[PDB]
Design a protein around this motif. Sequence first.
Motif, PDB file in Angstrom:
ATOM      1  N   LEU A 196      23.437   3.584  27.016  1.00 64.95           N
ATOM      2  CA  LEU A 196      24.187   2.527  27.678  1.00 64.95           C
ATOM      3  C   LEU A 196      23.323   1.948  28.788  1.00 64.95           C
ATOM      4  CD1 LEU A 196      27.713   4.206  28.000  1.00 64.95           C
ATOM      5  CD2 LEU A 196      26.917   2.651  26.212  1.00 64.95           C
ATOM      6  N   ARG A 197      23.369   0.619  28.934  1.00 66.48           N
ATOM      7  CA  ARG A 197      22.520  -0.052  29.916  1.00 66.48           C
ATOM      8  C   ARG A 197      22.747   0.499  31.318  1.00 66.48           C
ATOM      9  NH1 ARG A 197      23.825  -6.224  30.785  1.00 66.48           N
ATOM     10  NH2 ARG A 197      25.759  -5.159  31.415  1.00 66.48           N
ATOM     11  N   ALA A 198      24.007   0.763  31.675  1.00 66.04           N
ATOM     12  CA  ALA A 198      24.316   1.274  33.005  1.00 66.04           C
ATOM     13  C   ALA A 198      23.722   2.656  33.259  1.00 66.04           C
ATOM     14  CB  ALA A 198      25.830   1.311  33.215  1.00 66.04           C
ATOM     15  N   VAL A 249      22.272  -0.593  24.865  1.00 65.93           N
ATOM     16  CA  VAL A 249      23.485  -1.268  24.415  1.00 65.93           C
ATOM     17  C   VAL A 249      24.445  -1.401  25.589  1.00 65.93           C
ATOM     18  CG1 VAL A 249      25.306  -1.326  22.657  1.00 65.93           C
ATOM     19  CG2 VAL A 249      23.121  -0.165  22.170  1.00 65.93           C
ATOM     20  N   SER A 250      25.177  -2.514  25.627  1.00 68.81           N
ATOM     21  CA  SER A 250      26.173  -2.738  26.664  1.00 68.81           C
ATOM     22  C   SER A 250      27.224  -3.706  26.140  1.00 68.81           C
ATOM     23  CB  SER A 250      25.534  -3.278  27.946  1.00 68.81           C
ATOM     24  OG  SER A 250      24.827  -4.473  27.676  1.00 68.81           O
TER      25      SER A 250
HETATM   26 CL   LIG Z   1      26.505  -0.488  29.848  1.00 72.02          CL
END
Ligand SMILES: [Cl-]
Lengths: 353, 352
Positions: free
Chosen positions: B26-28, B69-70
Amino acid sequence: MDSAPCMWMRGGTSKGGYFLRADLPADTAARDAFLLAVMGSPDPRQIDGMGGADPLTSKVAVVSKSERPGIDVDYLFLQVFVDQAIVTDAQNCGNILAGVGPFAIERGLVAASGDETRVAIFMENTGQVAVATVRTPGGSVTYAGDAAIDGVPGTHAPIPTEFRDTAGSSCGALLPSGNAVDVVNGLPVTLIDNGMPCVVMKAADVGITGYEDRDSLDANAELKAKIEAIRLAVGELMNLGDVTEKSVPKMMLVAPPRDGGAVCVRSFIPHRAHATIGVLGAVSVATACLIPGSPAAEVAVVPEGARKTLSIEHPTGEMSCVLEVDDAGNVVSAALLRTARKLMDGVVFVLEH
Amino acid sequence: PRRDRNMDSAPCMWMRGGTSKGGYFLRADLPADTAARDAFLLAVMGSPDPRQIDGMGGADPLTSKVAVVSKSERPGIDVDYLFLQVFVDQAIVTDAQNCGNILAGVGPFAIERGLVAASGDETRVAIFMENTGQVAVATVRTPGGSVTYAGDAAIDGVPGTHAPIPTEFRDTAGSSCGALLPSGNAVDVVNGLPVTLIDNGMPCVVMKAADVGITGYEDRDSLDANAELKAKIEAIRLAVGELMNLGDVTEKSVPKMMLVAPPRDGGAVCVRSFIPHRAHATIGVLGAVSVATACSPAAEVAVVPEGARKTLSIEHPTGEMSCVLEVNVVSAALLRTARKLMDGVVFVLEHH
Ligand SMILES: [Cl-]
Ligand SMILES: [Ca+2]
Ligand SMILES: [Ca+2]
Ligand SMILES: [Cl-]
Ligand SMILES: [Cl-]
Ligand SMILES: [Cl-]
Ligand SMILES: [Cl-]
Ligand SMILES: [Cl-]
Ligand SMILES: [Cl-]
Ligand SMILES: [Cl-]
Ligand SMILES: [Cl-]
Ligand code: NA
């Protein structure tokens, strides 16, 4: 069983999955089928699993709390073949062993004993014991540090590993033939098992110097044939049965040191030229250096004292083995440096049966 | 408590995507700064190291890949997907090209991570491919609301069978170049032989294999050892780089060289792809879209299917890849599969 908790670690110069025994099937057929699917074997690319398409990155450790006296954890090493539906437990891997100690502490199998924790490991493949010293600052494992080993970039936390009960672990005696030197196919050799069955002979006696590049030796068909003929002829002398399809004994070609060590080696394991040297083979080679009149003693520079550091030169550097020797001459323990690193922790998945 | 004070970490799912393998994030969960992110991803893989022994990379570029991915806020898009190639023996992470194989894991990854809700027994995931600005729609088997990876679908280069992941591509014309025909005219000619500069998902140079002195049926080793052929097609590539609006492509990996030939094993076309110097084992997913689209020079050898929904089986060395085209090219659909291999947390040595 479609999944299992698993830790992927680098142990020494190998890589693989670390499991608790209670998390794997009890039936060995169901276990092997699970591990094959975990790795993505059989497949030369191992694209559908966690194996790295190389035997050194297709390995498994099965660890469990031990009921043996003085032993913390039991350790079963399994080689998952890359391109065959085969999982084998013959012979032990001293590199995957490096991750067993930290893995057991992380999993709570062994409580951390301060900033530095010693883990007594029973190697179930050959019935020998290793004591690994793990860096546990503040009560938790770390994998970072200033220690380095050949074949691994950078530096990591040191894992000193002391081996005991190694003599004759596979062959039933340190010298299964009862001789310091045996003449095989016209050449003097030492048949020795101090953790790993080995044939030790002078590189010059098989027509090389022993300093050649690994790739040059790996392509020397005449040399490999000469060595292999010796290996086949001593399988019964070493109480190993028919060794035609076995990976033992390792063939250790020794020569005087050239990089400041005690001795130089080129190892065939049993067919391919090793880039370094096996951890347990190093103990056998170092022990052979101490046997008077043997090919290894003829070329080795052995220091005096009850504690001897024997640096074994190999194609990519050297592996040092600390031998503890009593006042008579017997090796009571051998200590070598390894490192490890937890790479990923979680759950591995396979398609259901 | 009881964590390694000298390491950093992130949640990560290791998956097979098509014929590739890598880590899905995940991008975060990654550092926002590019330099810090690249250092983290290199350490995740064990790069740089030809053996990648101290990481999760498989010592091959195809098993040293990353997906970021986000949840998307673009109209009609479910998730945004950034593909990153983590070099094996160099301290390099790049986003220059778009992998249609790692793409196969994005859809199932997005559903398992809750970025997209499961819409019954099959779930459609619209994926914005940020590397090239294309949109892919993956149909993921989600029986009972949960992603499955088991099924009867097979693709060359992957043993066994898995759940099918049909992937439809839209907005592919001029993904890397200005338009579908970057030169302006369809069949141009460089160095005497007729070619076709076309970009319908992957910039390619389509040309007849006979016009370059081969038949188009040789093996990977026989073509990659052919110094005469490679020099001829490299000079074609080095003379169309700026013409295809690609700048100086001497150090780039684009465009792909596509040598077409009539089929032998019952397919539509046989192709030999240089990507740009190595003989591709199969063929690129997006490259197959550009080649299937190329079918007068490609029409010389193509046994084009009949109906409005054509299954063009593109014969490559290790088998074939089928590209469903609907007709004017409406959509380009290809079959891929994926599998979740491991899920948890990946760890790296702290940078300092
Ligand atoms: Cl994300
Ligand atoms: Ca820190
Ligand atoms: Ca940290
Ligand atoms: Cl257990
Ligand atoms: Cl193997
Ligand atoms: Cl070993
Ligand atoms: Cl060498
Ligand atoms: Cl071998
Ligand atoms: Cl690379
Ligand atoms: Cl692709
Ligand atoms: Cl290339
Ligand atoms: Na922990």
